[PDB]
Write a protein that binds this ligand. Structure first.
Ligand SMILES: [Cl-]
Ligand SMILES: [Cl-]
Ligand SMILES: [Cl-]
Ligand SMILES: [Cl-]
Lengths: 172, 172, 172, 172
């Protein structure tokens, strides 16, 4: 490449893997969103929360691909694994699965940041810091806040709590 | 001092003590606010109620300091004690602690008003009457209203009630 | 904690200590501001400079507390020591004390950045870089500029110079 | 009188005396204002400061007279003594004479407040508290601030300092 400078093959490959992880996360959120749109689930705010995250993770993948080309690396796409479940249980089950997924993406971001620091690639490090690390901490905090509110609403009237959370916390 | 007139050393010292009490109350409300922002507490309206009071009590301290200088007294600052708790329990526990704190500030206002009246300091008396006494009665009434609503919502579904109070009474 | 990830106990504790340092600095600036509002000091622009810094340092403390919760750490508050002086001397004395205070806060920021780098905590490092390190360098440069102008105005007519600096450099 | 209620002859007479004191103060400020308009004095900002106070004290007298009639007392006017000086010296001399005058008016306000309190006349007490006592404290603080700035500007270049104070502190 006529532009590539200070961009290791190790970083290039790890960026392609991170693109796959974000596209997989987007797919997981698409499945979560349409589960909550089922006529036998019918939680509009929950559907909208996860459909927004599906678009937000696709955006993250596209930002990584733009950066891959800016650095002179080569995008390489792999098969995208289907999500881990076909049915996602309750809002609580879904929000737990979402925070597990986000902690996995956050650890992948931290791992790539550590590789960039080891390879003295400050453009890679700054790119993650400026576009991903704080967005990810803020999303995980939001999901933790939601999990606590869902948990406090279960009590012995689980259906009432799940309705109220969707109506009074989530955007619909 | 070239301006000081009818301003006793007793009032000057009691004003400095009241500044300390208001700055301590502001600090207590800062701690209450950030407790309700914890991911394992997550009651946004409760966080906002106490963060507003932290700013409101700081304002009261600054108004007292402005008056101290207007009268020709000398601001003297003391160490600010940490709040009484690191964790504040439920919204009910927190709102009870807040009304105990406000009754303590109100008694300090009444004590300083009585000293000013004994020292025939009508500017001090009017300053408290016009800027503090009614604001304090109105805040205590608001907190009493909130305590009654929180208490009526406990029943046997405490988590549901605490969610509903935060969602439907407090500003978020 | 259900959200905490890559957030060491060492960083958590150092963040709480930095919150204390910023709240102490805010308190120091409150005392400086009201000293310059005394009828026997009466330098409005100097009062406003330090009152603005009192609010700016409180803001910094609140930003650290927000981040502490975003990361899943626990805010812990300590007693806030009174400022180092009750009377602050001349504008020159005050601006020297302010730059000593700011260099102490800047070294605390640099120390926490170095701890975050040692603990491979890039979110902490980016948070300080993006919200504190450049703001602090810019504030110290401004104070250095002011110290030089105050020093050039002393000559043998110190009162004239102190008036002129307040009138023609500081906002009133 | 068909309206008079709870309004002692002692208060009525003291209100008429206070009207005389405010009209005398207005006259003193008229003389101060026109002294600073002399071609051999020529300090426009100083002239404007004292001309504003002449109008402000006339206003205070008219507010007392309105209240005298509202209470059913009878305005009684006495001769208005000429001001204490025909020539007022420097801005410093003038601002010292002004603070002596204002402390005398403030003590008269405090004396009438104490008489009203002794006579259980709360309308009189509230009238002074709401319209006079804080305005007077604020004016005396402003004059003290000005005296300190004038004093710091004397040094060994008195004419330079007096020019600069008029140009850079007073409104012209
Ligand atoms: Cl699979
Ligand atoms: Cl303590
Ligand atoms: Cl100390
Ligand atoms: Cl006479």
């Amino acid at each position: 490449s006529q532009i590539r400078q200070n961009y290791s093959t190790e970083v290039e490959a790890a960026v392609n893997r991170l693109v796959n992880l974000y596209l997989r996360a987007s797919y997981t959120y698409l499945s979560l969103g349409f589960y909550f749109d089922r006529d036998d689930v019918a939680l509009e705010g929950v559907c909208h929360f996860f459909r927004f995250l599906a678009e937000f993770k696709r955006f993250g993948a596209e930002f990584l691909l733009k950066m891959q080309n800016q650095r002179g690396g080569r995008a390489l796409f792999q098969d995208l694994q289907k999500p881990s479940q076909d049915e996602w249980g309750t809002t609580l089950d879904a929000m737990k699965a979402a925070i597990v997924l986000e902690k996995s993406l956050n650890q992948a971001l931290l791992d790539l940041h550590a590789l960039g620091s080891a390879q003295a690639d400050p453009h890679l490090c700054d790119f993650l810091e400026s576009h991903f690390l704080d967005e990810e901490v803020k999303l995980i905090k939001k999901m933790g806040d939601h999990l606590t509110n869902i948990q406090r609403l279960v009590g012995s009237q689980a259906g009432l709590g799940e309705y109220l959370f969707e109506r009074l916390t989530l955007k619909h």
